[PDB]
């Protein structure tokens, strides 16, 4: 139960979801860009983008705006799960190629 890792930014959040900013600590362009790409591949998402507000802080604000179908939190969850599935695909292909050679 990590209550400090990901935070919904309430000031940058719309009524009834569909728009939100999430602050993620100890993360940088590595996760930000991959997560943004995966989320942008969601047909309901109309706005995905992250920013590292300052280099001196291990911090990352990712912005999600959707249409009315789902919420920004659900879009983020789907994006994270799809990133995991992508990583599984890559791992399986690399492992089978290493074994075969």
């Amino acid at each position: 139960p990590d209550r400090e890792k990901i935070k919904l930014l309430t000031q940058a959040t719309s009524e009834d979801g569909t728009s939100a900013s999430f602050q993620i600590v100890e993360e940088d362009h590595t996760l930000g860009n991959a997560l943004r790409y995966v989320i942008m591949k969601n047909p309901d998402v109309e706005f995905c983008g992250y920013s590292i507000p300052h280099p001196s802080e291990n911090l990352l604000n990712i912005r999600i705006q959707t249409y009315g179908e789902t919420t920004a939190v659900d879009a983020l969850q789907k994006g994270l799960k799809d990133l995991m599935d992508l990583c599984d695909v890559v791992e399986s292909k690399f492992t089978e190629k290493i074994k075969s050679m």
Partner: peptide
Amino acid sequence: VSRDTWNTKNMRSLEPP
């Protein structure tokens, strides 16, 4: 080469300190 070490060796160092 061409032999998996991730399968046989448990990755301890990858745990978050």
